[PDB]
Amino acid sequence: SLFELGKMILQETGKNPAKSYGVYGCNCGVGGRGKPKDATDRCCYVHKCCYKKLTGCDPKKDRYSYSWKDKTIVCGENNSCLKELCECDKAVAICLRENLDTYNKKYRYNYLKPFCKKADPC
Numbered sequence: 001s002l003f004e005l006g007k008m009i010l011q012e013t014g015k016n017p018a019k020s021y022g023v024y025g026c027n028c029g030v031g032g033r034g035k036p037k038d039a040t041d042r043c044c045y046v047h048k049c050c051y052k053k054l055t056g057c058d059p060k061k062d063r064y065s066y067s068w069k070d071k072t073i074v075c076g077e078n079n080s081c082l083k084e085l086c087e088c089d090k091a092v093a094i095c096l097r098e099n100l101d102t103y104n105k106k107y108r109y110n111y112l113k114p115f116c117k118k119a120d121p122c
Contacts, residue, residue, distance in 0.1 A: 001063045004086070008066070008073050008093035013100060021096065025107040026116035034116025040103050043095035049122035050088035056081035059088070066090070 009017040018029075025041030026034030027048060036042040051059045056079070064086045065076030073093060075086035096103075110116075 001058075002060050004064060004066060005089045005092075008089050009096055011068065011073065012093035012097035015100075020103070020108065023109050023111065023113065025110055026113060027119070031113045033119035034113065035119060037107050037110075038102055038104060039099040040096055041107065043092050043099060045119065046095065047088060047092035050091065051085075052122055054081055054085055054088070057085055059085050 006017040009015070009021060013020070015021075021040075021044065022029040025037040025044065027036055027041045028044035033045050033048050036045045062082060062085065064082035065078055066086050067074050067076070073090040075083060075090060077083065078086075
């Protein structure tokens with residue numbers, strides 16, 4: 001769910017998740033996808049795409065189990081959808097972490113998300 005997602009992002013990036021990615025670019029946080037503004041944004045673009053492949057569970061409300069092992073997010077082996085959901089979340093946290101080098105504060109609070117160019121299909 002959103003809780004696990006935010007926690008993973010905090011763990012991987014060490015940044016307030018909502019603060020840094022709640023409204024970042026055209027794909028991070030609220031809203032759907034849009035033309036990515038940068039690598040960090042693409043991470044979220046990929047993440048939202050990952051969510052579409054899910055069936056059987058609610059990505060935003062459904063809680064799933066995962067642990068912190070050797071500073072690595074390890075998804076619990078619960079049901080298939082929750083499992084894939086968890087992996088989707090793990091992947092975006094990791095991706096956001098990997099692209100902190102280009103993270104740009106200027107994209108942090110994009111209140112113009114509705115104006116973003118339409119995203120191509122996943």
